[PDB]
Coordinates of C-alpha atoms and ligand atoms in Angstrom, one line a residue:
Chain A
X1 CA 12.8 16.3 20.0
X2 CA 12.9 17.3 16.4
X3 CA 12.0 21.5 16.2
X4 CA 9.6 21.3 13.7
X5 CA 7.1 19.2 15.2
X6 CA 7.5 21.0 18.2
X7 CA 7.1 24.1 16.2
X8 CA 3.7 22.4 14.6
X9 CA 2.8 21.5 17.9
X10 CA 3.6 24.6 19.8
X11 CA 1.1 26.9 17.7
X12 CA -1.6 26.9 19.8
X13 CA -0.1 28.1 22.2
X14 CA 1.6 30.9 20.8
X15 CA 0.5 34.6 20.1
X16 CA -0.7 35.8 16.7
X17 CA 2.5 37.7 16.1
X18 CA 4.6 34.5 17.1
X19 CA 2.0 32.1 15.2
X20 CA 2.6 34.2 11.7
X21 CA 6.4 33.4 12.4
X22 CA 5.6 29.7 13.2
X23 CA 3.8 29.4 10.3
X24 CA 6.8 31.2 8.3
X25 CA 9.5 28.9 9.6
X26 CA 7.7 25.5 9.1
X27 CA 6.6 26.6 5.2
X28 CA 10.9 26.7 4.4
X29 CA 12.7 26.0 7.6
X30 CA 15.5 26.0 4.8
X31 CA 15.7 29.8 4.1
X32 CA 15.5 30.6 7.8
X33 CA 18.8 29.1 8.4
X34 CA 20.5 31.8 6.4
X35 CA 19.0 34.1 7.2
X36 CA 19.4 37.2 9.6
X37 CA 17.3 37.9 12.4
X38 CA 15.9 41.4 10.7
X39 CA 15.6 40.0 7.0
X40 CA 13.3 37.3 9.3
X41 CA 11.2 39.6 10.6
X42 CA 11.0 41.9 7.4
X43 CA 9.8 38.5 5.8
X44 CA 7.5 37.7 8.4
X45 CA 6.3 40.9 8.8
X46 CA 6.8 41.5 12.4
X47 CA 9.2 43.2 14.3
X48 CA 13.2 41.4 15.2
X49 CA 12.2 41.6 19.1
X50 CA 8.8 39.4 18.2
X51 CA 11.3 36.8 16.4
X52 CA 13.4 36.7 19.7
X53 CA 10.2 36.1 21.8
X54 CA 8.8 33.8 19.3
X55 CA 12.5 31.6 19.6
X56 CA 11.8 31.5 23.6
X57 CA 8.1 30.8 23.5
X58 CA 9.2 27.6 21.4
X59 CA 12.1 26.6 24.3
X60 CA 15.3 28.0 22.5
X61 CA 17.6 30.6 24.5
X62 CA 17.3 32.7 21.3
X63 CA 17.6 33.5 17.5
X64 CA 20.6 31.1 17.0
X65 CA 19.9 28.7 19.3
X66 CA 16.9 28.3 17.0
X67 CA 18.7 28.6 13.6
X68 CA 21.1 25.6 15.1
X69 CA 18.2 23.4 16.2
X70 CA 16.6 24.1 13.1
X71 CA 20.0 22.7 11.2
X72 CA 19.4 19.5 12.7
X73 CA 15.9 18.8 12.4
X74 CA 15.5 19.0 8.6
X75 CA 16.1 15.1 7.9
X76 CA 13.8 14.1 5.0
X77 CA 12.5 11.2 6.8
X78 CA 10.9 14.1 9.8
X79 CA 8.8 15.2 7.6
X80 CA 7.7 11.2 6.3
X81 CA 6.9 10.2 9.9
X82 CA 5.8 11.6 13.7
X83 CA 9.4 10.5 15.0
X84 CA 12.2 12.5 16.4
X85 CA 14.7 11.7 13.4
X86 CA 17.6 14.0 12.8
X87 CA 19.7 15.0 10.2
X88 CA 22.4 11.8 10.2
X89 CA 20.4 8.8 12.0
X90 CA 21.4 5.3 11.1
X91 CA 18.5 2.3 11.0
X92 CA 20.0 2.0 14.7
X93 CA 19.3 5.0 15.5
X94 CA 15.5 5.6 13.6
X95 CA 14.8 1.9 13.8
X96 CA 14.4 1.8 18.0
X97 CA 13.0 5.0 17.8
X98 CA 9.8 4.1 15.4
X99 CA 9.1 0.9 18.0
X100 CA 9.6 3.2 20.7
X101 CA 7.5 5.9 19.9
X102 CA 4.8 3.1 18.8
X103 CA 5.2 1.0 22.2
X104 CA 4.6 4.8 23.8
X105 CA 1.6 5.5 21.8
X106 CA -0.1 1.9 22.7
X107 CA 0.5 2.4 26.5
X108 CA -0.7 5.9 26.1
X109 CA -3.9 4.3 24.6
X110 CA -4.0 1.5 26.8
X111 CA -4.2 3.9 29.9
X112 CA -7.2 6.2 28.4
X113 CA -9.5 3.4 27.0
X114 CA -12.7 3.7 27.6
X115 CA -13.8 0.1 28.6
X116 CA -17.4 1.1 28.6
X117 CA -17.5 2.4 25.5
X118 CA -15.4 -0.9 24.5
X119 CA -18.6 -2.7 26.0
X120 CA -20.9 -0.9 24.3
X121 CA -19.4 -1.5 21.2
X122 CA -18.6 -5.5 21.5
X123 CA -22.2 -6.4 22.6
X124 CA -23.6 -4.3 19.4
X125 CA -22.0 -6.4 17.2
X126 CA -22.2 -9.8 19.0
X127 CA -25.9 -9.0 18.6
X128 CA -25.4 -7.8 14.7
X129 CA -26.1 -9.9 11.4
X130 CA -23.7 -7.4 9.3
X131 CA -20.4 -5.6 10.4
X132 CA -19.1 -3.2 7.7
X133 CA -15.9 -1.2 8.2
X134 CA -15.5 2.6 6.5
X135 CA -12.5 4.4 5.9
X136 CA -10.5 5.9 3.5
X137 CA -6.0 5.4 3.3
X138 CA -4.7 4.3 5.9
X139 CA -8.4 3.7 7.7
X140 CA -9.2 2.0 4.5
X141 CA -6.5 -0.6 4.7
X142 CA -7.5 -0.9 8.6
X143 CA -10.9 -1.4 7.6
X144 CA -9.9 -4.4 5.3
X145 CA -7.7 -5.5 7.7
X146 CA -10.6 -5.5 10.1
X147 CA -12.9 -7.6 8.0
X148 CA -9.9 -10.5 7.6
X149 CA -10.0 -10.5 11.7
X150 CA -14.4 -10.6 11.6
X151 CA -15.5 -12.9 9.2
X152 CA -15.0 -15.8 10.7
X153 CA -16.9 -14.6 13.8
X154 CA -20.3 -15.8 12.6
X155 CA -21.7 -12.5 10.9
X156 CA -21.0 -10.9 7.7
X157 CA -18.2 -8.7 7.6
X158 CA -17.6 -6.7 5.0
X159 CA -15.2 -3.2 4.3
X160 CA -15.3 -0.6 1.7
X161 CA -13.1 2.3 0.6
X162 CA -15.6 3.5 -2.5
X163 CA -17.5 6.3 -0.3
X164 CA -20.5 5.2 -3.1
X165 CA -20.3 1.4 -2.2
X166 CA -20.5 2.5 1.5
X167 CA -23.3 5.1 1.0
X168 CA -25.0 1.9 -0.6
X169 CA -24.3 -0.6 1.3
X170 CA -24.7 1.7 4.3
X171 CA -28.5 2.8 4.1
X172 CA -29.1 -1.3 3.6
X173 CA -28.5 -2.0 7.3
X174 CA -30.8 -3.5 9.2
X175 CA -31.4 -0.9 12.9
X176 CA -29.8 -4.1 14.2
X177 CA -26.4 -4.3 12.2
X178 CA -23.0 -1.9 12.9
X179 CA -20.5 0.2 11.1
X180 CA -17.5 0.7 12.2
X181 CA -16.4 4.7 11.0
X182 CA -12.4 4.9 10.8
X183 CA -10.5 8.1 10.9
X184 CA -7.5 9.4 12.6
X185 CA -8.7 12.8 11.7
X186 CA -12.3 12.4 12.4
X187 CA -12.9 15.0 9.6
X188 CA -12.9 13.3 6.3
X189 CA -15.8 14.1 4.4
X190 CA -17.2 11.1 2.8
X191 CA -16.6 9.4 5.8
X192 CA -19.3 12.0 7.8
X193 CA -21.8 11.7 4.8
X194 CA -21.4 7.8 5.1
X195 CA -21.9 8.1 9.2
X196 CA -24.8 10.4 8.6
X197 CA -26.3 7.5 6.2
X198 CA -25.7 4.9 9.0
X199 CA -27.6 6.8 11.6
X200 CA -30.1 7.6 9.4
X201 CA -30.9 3.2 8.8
X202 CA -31.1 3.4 12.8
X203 CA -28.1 1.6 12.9
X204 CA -25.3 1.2 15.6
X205 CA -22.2 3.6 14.4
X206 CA -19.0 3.2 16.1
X207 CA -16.5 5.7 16.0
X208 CA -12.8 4.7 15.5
X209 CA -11.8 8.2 15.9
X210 CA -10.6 10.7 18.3
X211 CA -13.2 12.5 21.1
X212 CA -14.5 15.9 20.1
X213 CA -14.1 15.4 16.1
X214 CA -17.1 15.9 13.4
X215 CA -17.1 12.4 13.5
X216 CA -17.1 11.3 16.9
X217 CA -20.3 14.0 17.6
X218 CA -22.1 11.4 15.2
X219 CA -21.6 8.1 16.8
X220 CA -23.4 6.1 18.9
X221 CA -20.5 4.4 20.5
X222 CA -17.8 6.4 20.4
X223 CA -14.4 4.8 21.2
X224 CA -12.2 8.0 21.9
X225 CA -8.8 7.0 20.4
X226 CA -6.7 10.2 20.7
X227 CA -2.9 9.2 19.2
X228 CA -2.0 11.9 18.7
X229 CA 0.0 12.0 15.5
X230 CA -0.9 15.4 13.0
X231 CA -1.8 13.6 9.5
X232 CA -1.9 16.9 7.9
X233 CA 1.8 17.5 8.3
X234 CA 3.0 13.2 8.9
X235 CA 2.2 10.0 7.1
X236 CA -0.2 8.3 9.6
X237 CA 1.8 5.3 10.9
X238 CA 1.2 5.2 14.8
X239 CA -2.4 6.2 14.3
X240 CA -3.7 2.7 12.5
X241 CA -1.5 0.4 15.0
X242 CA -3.4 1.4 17.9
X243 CA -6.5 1.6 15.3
X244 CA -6.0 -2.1 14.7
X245 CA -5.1 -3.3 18.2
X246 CA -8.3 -1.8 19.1
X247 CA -10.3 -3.7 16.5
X248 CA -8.4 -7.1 17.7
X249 CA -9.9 -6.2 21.4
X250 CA -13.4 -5.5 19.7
X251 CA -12.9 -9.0 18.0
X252 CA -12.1 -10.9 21.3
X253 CA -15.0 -9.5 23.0
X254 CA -17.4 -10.8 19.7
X255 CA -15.6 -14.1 20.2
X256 CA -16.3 -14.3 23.8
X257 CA -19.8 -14.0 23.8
X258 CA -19.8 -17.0 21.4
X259 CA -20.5 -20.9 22.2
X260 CA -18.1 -23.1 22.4
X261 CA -19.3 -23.5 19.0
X262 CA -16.8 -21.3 17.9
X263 CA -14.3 -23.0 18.5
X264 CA -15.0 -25.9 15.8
X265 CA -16.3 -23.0 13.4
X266 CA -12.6 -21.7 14.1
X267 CA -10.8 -25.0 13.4
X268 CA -12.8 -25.6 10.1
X269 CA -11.5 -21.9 9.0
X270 CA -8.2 -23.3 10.2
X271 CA -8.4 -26.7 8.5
X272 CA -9.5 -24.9 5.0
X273 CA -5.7 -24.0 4.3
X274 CA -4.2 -27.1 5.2
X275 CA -4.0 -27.6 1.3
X276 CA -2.7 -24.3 0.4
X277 CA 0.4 -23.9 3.6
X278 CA 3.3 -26.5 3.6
X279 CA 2.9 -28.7 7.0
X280 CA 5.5 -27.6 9.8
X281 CA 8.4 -29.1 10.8
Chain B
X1 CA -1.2 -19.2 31.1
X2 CA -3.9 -20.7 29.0
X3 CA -3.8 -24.5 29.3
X4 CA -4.2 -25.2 25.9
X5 CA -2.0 -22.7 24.3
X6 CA 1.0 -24.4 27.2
X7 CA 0.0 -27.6 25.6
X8 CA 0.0 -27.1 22.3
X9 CA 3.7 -24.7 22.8
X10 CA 4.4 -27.5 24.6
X11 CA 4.8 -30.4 22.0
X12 CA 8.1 -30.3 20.8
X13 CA 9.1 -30.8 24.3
X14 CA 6.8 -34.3 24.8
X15 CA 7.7 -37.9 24.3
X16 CA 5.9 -39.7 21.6
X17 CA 3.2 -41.2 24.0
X18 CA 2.8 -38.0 26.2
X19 CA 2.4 -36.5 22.3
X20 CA -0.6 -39.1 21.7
X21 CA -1.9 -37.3 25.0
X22 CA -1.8 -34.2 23.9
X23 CA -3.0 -34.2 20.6
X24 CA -5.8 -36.2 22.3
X25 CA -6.4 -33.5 24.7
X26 CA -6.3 -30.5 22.1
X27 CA -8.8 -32.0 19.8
X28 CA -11.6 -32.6 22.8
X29 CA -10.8 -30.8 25.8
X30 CA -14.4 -31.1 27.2
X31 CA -14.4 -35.0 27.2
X32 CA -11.5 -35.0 29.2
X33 CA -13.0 -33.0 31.7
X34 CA -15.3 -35.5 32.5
X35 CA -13.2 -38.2 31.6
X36 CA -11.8 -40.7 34.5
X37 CA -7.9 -41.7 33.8
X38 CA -8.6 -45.0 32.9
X39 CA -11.0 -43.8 30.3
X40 CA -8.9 -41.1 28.5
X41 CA -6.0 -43.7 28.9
X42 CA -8.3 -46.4 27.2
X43 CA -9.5 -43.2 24.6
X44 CA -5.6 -42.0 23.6
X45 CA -4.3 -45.7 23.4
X46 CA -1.8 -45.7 26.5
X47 CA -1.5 -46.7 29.5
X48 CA -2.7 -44.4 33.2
X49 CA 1.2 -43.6 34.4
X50 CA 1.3 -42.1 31.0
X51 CA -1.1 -39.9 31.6
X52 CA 0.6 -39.4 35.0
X53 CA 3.8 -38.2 33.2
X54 CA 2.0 -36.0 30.6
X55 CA 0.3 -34.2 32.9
X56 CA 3.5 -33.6 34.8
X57 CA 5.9 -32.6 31.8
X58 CA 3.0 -29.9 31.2
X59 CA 3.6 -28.8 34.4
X60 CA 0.8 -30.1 36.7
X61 CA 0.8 -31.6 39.6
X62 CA -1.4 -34.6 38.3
X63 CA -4.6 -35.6 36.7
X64 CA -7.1 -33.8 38.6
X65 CA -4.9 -30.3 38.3
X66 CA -5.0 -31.2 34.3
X67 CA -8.9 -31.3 34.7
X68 CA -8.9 -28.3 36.8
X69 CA -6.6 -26.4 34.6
X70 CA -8.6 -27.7 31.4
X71 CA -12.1 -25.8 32.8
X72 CA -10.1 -22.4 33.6
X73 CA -8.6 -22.6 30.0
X74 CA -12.2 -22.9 27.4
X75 CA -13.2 -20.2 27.0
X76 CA -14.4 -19.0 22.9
X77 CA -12.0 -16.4 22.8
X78 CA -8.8 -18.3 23.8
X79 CA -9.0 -20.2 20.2
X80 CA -9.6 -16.7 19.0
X81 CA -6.3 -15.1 19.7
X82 CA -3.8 -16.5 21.0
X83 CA -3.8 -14.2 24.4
X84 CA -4.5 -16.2 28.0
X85 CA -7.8 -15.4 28.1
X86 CA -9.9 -17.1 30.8
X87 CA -13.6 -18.6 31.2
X88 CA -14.7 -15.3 32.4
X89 CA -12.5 -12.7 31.3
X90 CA -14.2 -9.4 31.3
X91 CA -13.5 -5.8 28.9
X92 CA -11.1 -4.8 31.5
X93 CA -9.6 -8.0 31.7
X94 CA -9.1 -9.0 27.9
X95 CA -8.0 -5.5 26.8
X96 CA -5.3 -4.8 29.2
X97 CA -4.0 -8.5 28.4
X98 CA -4.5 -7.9 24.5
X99 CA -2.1 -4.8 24.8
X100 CA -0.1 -5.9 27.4
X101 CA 1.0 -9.0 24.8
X102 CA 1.5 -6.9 22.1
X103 CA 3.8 -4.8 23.7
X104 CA 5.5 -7.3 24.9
X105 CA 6.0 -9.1 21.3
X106 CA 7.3 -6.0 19.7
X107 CA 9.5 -5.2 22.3
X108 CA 11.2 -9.0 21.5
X109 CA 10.7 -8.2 17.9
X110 CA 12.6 -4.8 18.7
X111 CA 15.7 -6.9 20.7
X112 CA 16.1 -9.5 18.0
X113 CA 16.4 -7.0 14.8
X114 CA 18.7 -7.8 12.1
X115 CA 19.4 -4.3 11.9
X116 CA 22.1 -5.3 8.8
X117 CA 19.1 -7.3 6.8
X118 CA 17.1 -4.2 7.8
X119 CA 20.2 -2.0 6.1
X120 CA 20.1 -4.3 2.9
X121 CA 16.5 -4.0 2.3
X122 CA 16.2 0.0 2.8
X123 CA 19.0 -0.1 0.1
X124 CA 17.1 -2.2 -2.2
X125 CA 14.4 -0.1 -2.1
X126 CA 16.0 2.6 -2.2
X127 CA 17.4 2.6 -5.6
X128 CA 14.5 0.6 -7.4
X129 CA 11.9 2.4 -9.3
X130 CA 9.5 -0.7 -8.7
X131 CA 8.6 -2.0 -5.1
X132 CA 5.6 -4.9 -4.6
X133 CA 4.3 -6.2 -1.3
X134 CA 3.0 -10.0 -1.8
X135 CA 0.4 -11.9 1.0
X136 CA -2.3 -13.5 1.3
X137 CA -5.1 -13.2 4.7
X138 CA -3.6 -10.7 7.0
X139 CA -0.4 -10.6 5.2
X140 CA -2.5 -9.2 2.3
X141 CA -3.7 -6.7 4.3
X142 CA -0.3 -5.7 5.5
X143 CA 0.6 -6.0 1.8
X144 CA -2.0 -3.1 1.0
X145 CA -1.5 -1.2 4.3
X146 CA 2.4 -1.0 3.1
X147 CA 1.5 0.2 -0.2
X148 CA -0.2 2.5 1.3
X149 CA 2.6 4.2 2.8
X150 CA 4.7 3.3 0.1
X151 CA 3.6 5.1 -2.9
X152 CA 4.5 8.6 -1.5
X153 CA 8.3 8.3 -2.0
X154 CA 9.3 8.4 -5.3
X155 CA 8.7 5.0 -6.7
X156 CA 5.9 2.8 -8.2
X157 CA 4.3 0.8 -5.6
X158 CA 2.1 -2.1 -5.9
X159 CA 0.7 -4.4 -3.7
X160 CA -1.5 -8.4 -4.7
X161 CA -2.7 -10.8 -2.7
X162 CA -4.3 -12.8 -5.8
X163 CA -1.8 -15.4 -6.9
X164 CA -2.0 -15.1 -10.6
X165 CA -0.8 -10.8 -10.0
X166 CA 1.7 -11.5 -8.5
X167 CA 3.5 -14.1 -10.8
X168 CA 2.3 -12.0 -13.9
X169 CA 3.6 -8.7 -12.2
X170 CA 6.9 -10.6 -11.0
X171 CA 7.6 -11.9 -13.8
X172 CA 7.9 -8.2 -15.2
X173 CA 10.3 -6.9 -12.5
X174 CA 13.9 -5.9 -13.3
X175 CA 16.7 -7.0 -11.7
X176 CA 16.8 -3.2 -10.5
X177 CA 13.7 -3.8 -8.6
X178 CA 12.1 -5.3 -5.4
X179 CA 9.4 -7.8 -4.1
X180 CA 8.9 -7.7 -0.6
X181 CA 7.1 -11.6 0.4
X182 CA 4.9 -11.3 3.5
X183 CA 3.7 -14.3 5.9
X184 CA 4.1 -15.4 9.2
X185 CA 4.3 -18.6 8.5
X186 CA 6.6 -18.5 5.7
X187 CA 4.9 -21.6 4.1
X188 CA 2.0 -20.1 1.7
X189 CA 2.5 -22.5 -1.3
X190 CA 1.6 -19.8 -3.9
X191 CA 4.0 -17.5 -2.1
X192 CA 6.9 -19.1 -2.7
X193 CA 5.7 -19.6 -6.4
X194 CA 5.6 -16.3 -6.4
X195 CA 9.0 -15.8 -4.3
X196 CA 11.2 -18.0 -7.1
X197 CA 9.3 -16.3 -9.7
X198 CA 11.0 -12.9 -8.6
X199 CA 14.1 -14.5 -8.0
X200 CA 14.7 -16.4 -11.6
X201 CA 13.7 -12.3 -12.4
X202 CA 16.5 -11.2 -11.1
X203 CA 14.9 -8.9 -8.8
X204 CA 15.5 -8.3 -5.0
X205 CA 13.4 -10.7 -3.0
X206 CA 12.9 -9.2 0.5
X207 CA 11.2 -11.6 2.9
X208 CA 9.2 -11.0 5.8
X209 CA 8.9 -13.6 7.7
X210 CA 10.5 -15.8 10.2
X211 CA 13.9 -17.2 10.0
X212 CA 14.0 -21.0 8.9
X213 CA 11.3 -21.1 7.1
X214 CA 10.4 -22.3 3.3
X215 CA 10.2 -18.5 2.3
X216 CA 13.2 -17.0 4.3
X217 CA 15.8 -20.2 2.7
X218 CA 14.4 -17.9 -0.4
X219 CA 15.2 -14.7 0.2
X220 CA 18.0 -12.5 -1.1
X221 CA 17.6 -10.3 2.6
X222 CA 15.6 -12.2 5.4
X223 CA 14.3 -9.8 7.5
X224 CA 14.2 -12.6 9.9
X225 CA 11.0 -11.4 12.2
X226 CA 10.2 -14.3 14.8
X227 CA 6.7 -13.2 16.4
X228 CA 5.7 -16.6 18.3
X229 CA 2.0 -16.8 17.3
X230 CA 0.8 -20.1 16.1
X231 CA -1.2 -19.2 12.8
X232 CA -2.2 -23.0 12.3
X233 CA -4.1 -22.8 15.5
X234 CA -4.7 -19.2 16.2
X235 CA -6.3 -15.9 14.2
X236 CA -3.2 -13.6 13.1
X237 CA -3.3 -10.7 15.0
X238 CA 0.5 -10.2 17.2
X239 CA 2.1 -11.3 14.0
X240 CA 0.6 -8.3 11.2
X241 CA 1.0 -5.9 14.1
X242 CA 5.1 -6.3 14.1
X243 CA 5.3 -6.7 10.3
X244 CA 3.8 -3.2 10.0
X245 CA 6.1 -1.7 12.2
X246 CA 8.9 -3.1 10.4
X247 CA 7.4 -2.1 7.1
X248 CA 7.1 1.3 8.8
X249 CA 11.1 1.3 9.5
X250 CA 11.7 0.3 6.4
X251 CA 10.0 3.4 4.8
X252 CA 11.2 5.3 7.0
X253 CA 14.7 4.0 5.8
X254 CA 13.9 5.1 2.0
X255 CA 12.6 8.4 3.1
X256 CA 16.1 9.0 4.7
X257 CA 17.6 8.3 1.3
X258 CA 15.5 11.1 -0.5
X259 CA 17.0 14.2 -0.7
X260 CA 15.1 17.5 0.5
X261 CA 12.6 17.4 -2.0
X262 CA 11.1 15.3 -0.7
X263 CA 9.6 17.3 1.8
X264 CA 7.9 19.4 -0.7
X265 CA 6.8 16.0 -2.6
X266 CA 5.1 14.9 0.4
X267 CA 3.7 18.3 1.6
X268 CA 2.0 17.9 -2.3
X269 CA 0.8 14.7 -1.1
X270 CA -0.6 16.2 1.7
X271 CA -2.3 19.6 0.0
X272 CA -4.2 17.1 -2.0
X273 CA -6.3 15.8 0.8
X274 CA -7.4 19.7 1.7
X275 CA -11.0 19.2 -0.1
X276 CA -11.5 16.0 1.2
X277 CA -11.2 16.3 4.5
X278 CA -12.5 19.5 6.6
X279 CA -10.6 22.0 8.0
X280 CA -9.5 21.7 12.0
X281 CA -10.2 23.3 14.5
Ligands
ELE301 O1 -1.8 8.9 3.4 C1 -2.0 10.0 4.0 O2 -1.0 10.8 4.1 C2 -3.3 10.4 4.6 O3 -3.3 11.1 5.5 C3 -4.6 9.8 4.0 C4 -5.5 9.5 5.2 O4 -5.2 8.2 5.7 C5 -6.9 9.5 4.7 O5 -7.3 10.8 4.2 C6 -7.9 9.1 5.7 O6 -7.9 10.1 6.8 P1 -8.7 9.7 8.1 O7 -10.2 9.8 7.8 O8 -8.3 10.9 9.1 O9 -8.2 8.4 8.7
ELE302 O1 -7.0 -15.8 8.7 C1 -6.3 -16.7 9.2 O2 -6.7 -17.4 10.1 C2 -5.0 -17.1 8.5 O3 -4.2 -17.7 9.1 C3 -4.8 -16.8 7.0 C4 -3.3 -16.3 6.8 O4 -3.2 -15.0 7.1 C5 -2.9 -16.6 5.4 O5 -3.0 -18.0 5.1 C6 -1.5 -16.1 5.1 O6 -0.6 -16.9 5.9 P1 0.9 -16.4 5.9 O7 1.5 -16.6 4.6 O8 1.6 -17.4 7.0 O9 1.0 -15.0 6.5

């Protein structure tokens, strides 16, 4: 467990005098390390017994205990990604550990999914003339993603990353058409003023999100997907796989409540790149 | 196991009038369903025994388990995505399997790495000032997700998914630099235009894709990624979900190779978003 995300993590537990050293050591873990315990809490601002308590709130036996932790936890790559990388990993070592933590993550999802919400969600859009996909980096690309995985499902699909284009598009929706809001944050601005213009068509919005964000009080369906990876500190990585394996479950329930019909609308689709893919062999 | 999914796995395995059978059977599952033996014997061109011993090599016990088996195994969704979906699947049901099968390829994926290819790659990367992700469909999307990621550490990155970008951006690349090619069947005809167009440049051609195919006899490292999902027949979905994660260990990889600036670079990164998205809380 690398000590800075468990630092990051631990500071809502902690008490206001321990938070402000928290705070302190994750803004230069660097400096820490050479540092004694009473030029700490002269930097701090708190007193070297407050240090000590902070250093056993966090799960180390004391000030050096958490200086040596701190030594190996300051790999580059920590910082990039939401995985328990130290110092002197190899692609062994940080290369099980990324499809780990993401095999983790799904399961995790997988066990809290709300299948009503999931069913709520699939018969909107099997019912919808228009599916359009918001989101902005990573949700952006997931949005796109999702409209390569819809359009062949016998409705238009489209995605958009311009918060203007989506304000646009947006208050064009039919009360009969979906959105599908993306956010592993929940709180990106656009995104909100987008949702709000969604609702305000009488459209169905679903909520790609986590419960108990901005976003997620605006939804119609909201779909409650709570990875729980901190994209203010990490690049969001884990966040848009279970994103996307949630839109592929949203797809097979549009699919299913097609004819049989779809299935020569799929082999068509198919057939159209027979031209522009080598044959196998 | 969906019957039409066994069958078309199933075809390598088949002698040439058993194959007849199949194909037969694939194309127009429904008339076979009410088809007598004589009749879909008379329809494929062979005689009834070879029926007899089709149905067997597939694994049933005759011609009326191949009916049987045939009306468990139509449902819309299982041309969808290739996940055994039955007639009358449910939320609960389709989810859990759609999961369930994607954990279950990346945990292959995960057993099978070429963790040296994976070595040469991160190394590549790691010392160009130019790195471009090439696809087209969902490995365009991948493309964009992994430029996404990408453009955070300390290089130029790019990603196209139309044709005529990617040989004119190629084309530019120095020797120095690297293309990373990205389909799952490894035989998109522009691709590998594209593919000898970074080559005769000089520049590192990363492939991702699977072994032994057009693309990966290309490659300077073959990343060598062997999802089974049949992309002629089914919508990519398994596939783009394991080239992520690999794209996500190979960034990963170059992070490792920044120094400890790089923390501060992507903590810049990060600050940047602060009046775009609301606060927590
Ligand atoms: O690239 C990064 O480091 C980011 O964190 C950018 C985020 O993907 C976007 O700001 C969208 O944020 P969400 O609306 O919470 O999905
Ligand atoms: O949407 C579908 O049904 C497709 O199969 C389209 C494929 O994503 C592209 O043709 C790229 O193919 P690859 O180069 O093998 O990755």
């Amino acid at each position: 467990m690398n000590l800075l995300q468990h630092i990051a993590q631990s500071r809502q537990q902690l008490r206001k005098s321990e938070l402000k050293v928290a705070d302190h050591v994750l803004n230069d873990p660097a400096s820490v390390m050479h540092s004694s315990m009473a030029e700490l809490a002269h930097g701090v601002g708190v007193s070297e017994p407050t240090i000590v308590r902070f250093c056993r709130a966090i799960g180390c036996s004391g000030f050096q205990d958490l200086k040596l932790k701190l030594a190996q936890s300051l790999a580059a790559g920590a910082s990039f990604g939401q995985f328990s990388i130290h110092e002197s990993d190899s692609v062994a070592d940080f290369s099980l550990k990324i499809f780990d933590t993401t095999l983790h993550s799904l399961m995790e999802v997988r066990e809290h999914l709300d299948t009503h919400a999931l069913e709520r969600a699939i018969a909107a859009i099997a019912h919808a003339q228009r599916v359009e996909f918001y989101g902005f980096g990573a949700s952006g690309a997931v949005a796109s993603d999702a409209q390569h995985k819809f359009f062949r499902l016998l409705l238009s699909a489209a995605a958009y990353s311009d918060p203007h284009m989506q304000a646009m598009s947006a208050v064009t929706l039919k009360p009969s058409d979906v959105a599908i809001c993306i956010s592993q944050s929940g709180r990106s601005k656009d995104l909100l003023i987008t949702a709000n213009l969604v609702r305000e068509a009488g459209a169905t919005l679903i909520t790609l999100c986590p419960s108990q964000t901005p976003l997620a009080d605006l939804a119609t369906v909201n779909l409650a997907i709570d990875v729980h990876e901190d994209t203010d500190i990490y690049t969001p990585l884990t966040s848009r796989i279970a994103h996307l394996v949630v839109i592929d479950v949203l797809a097979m329930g549009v699919a299913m409540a097609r004819g049989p019909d779809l299935v020569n609308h799929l082999k068509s689709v198919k057939r159209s790149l027979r031209s522009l893919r080598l044959s196998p062999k």
